Amino acid sequence: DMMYFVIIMLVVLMSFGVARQAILFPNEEPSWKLAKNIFYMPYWMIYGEVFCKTGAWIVPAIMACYLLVANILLVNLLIAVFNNTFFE
Amino acid sequence: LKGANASAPDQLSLALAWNRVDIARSQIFIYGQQWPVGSLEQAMLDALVLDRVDFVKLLIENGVSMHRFLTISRLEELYNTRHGPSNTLYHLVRDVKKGNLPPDYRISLIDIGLVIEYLMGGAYRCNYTRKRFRTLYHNLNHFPFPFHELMVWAVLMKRQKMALFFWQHGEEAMAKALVACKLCKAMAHEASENDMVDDISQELNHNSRDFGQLAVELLDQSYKQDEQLAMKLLTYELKNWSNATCLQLAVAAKHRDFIAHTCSQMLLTDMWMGRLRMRKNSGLKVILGILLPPSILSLEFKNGRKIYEFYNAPIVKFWFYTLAYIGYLMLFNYIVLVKMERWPSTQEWIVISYIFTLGIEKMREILMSGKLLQKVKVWLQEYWNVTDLIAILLFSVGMILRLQDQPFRSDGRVIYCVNIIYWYIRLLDIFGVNKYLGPYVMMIGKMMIDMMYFVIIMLVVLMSFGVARQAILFPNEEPSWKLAKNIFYMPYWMIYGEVFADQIKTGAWIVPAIMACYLLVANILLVNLLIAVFNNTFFEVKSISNQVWKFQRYQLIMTFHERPVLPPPLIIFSHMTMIFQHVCRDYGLKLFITDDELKKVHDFEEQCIEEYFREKDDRFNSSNDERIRVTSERVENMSMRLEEVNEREHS
Amino acid sequence: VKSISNQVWKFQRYQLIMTFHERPVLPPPLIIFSHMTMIFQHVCRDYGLKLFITDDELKKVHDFEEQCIEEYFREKDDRFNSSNDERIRVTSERVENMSMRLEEVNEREHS
């Protein structure tokens, strides 16, 4: 069950990370550094480490939605699943 | 009876009017009654219209045969009767005929056929409205299956006991059960619409539930007795019920418990695998065969042509679509992560072509689904289609905006970055095919509501605290939109662990106190209450999600059976094949059988229903309540008899 | 706790309805007008609380209630007399009485 919820969390996290990195940095030459910025910060920012370009104001809004979905909707569901599949 | 000294039909009519069946069973039907010719059928006709189940059964048991009794004229007289309980057949006839009928209008079988075709659905075509029957009815017999018409008559006129009696006699029991369930449900909806007395709208649902339960029990008995014949019974074309399988009738009736049964799941899996025999390990070998055409011939096919037979299996089409979608997603990520040129790159053109092909395929699908406005309403009934339309339109406006001046180019790139989130999220629909990822996605969808109902209160408290703190700390702010940002921002980041005691004047010391109260309320009470709510509303939600997923397997299988072989990115070739052919379901939907197999299946179903009824009666007569009641009655009777015996004194 | 909360909310619906039925039409920000027009009328529930009825309808309602209570008592008695415990007890008593009577019958010997 941990693995399944990890799969879903990875999908959502990659979506948010790619969207934010694409919005903020528009002039990046193709390099392997791009493949690291889409996973690193969105993964560290769900464990309590929370912190002009055109349309830069959408980043805090999508960040709020991402935190409210990943840190609330899925974690509590995982808790419920662990709770109700325990006796057997 | 013996005082009248009249003929047997007169005594029988008296007993029929009194609704006393045992008197007729004992006194009337005796050794050599010498019934006049035509008397028994007249008594059967009289007993039908008065709703006497016991007398109809008794007359059937003593020589009356429905195959000779029932004609077109007698059925017509049955449909126009008045000496019975209330029914809503006349209102349905009026609605179908749009109220043009004169008062005391004489109903005809064509009107009943129109009512049935209106009630069943869209593709239904009743046997009454076909050309052959209309020709035979204009120039004026026999009914090959009388019990079908008798059961339909009993269901439409709302006589439940007669319907249950006619259900167990004759062939095609499951088809009759499913059709009756659908008709009762549709009539309940129609009566609830036109402001009826509202007892009808809660008795017709009871009738529908009874018929659905009977169909499920009969399917369970058939599957227990034999699996291959049960699966063959669920697929053969029903000639008498507008050319549909039992599965399609179950799906149109929205009967979730019938599809969720194990037999239906095995049949749908065997449809999903197509012509391939592989059952122990699929998926990885399917994509192996997709990538390696030499690996295709090393597989096993059920009884040159192997490649064409392989590409038409639904599972191979599904995996091809999944691989194409994953490739498109990778190209989308690549074109949004790197710098954008003045003119689009090759991968951007691939993405645009894929989106255009998907859009035109969706519009072709909505254009092949009669009246234009009705297909739109049916196709917009799903949230996925609406989201696809919104995403495609937004992507089109981005494409229009992207090929313009530099600020418009930046705005188009931003709209692409925003739009990629939906195409990343939509992988959950692909995951719904998996046996475990479907129910969890449905469960998340159901828990969204409980999440929102606490998001509301969290917003209320958060806005209160933010306004209080911002008003205390900053007293000389000119009215600007910056004020509307400090209300929500910091108090929202402070509940996710980003609490800054350093970043928090007259009365400035109240800010830490209200901050402590706000943290203790928001991050302790509401969160744990939400956890408790999610915990205690989980079992029913997961069972419902499992049932709904098992029901939607059929729709997914049919959707990928209708799908063309090529994936959307290169669907252009087959999108112009039907254009030239316009001016120019052997299995996976039905299963055509011959006459001998049809007769064998009918006898099998009859044996199953007889066995099921016998088992039910045997189970009922051996339960504790029945034994206790019968023992009490016999003990009381014996006590009275023994009191009578001891009362006498010959001494 | 949730069952108790549901019950209490369903109970308090009535008080909320009566509270908003009594209140004046105007909202508090502009209630000053109805707060001074009521002063002048001092020296000058057709439905929503009750329902005044006629006499014939009153007779009909009384007969309906009497039929309902009679039916309810008859149904309760019929349900009670068919339960398993009652049948077991009555059967045991009748079997014991019958056994005593049959012992008396077989006790006599006219042979």
Ligand SMILES: COCC(CCO[C@H]1CC[C@@]2(C)C(=CC[C@H]3[C@@H]4C[C@@H]5O[C@]6(CC[C@@H](C)CO6)[C@@H](C)[C@@H]5[C@@]4(C)CC[C@@H]32)C1)COC
């Ligand atoms: C510094 O100079 C180096 C240069 C070499 C340039 O290499 C580039 C080649 C393309 C490559 C590997 C680069 C950056 C982002 C890479 C993408 C990250 C995305 O993330 C994924 C992963 C998860 C998916 C679900 C979504 O997308 C990939 C498919 C996507 C990806 C792997 C597609 C290919 C991209 C680097 C040499 O010059 C000759």
Ligand SMILES: COCC(CCO[C@H]1CC[C@@]2(C)C(=CC[C@H]3[C@@H]4C[C@@H]5O[C@]6(CC[C@@H](C)CO6)[C@@H](C)[C@@H]5[C@@]4(C)CC[C@@H]32)C1)COC
């Ligand atoms: C820099 O110069 C700009 C100036 C324009 C001045 O615009 C001001 C107009 C009033 C406005 C929009 C401003 C600041 C706070 C705004 C409030 C935030 C509050 O938050 C809410 C939201 C949630 C509610 C439940 C509580 O209050 C709003 C109702 C409340 C609000 C929208 C009421 C109106 C206020 C900006 C131009 O000079 C001509």
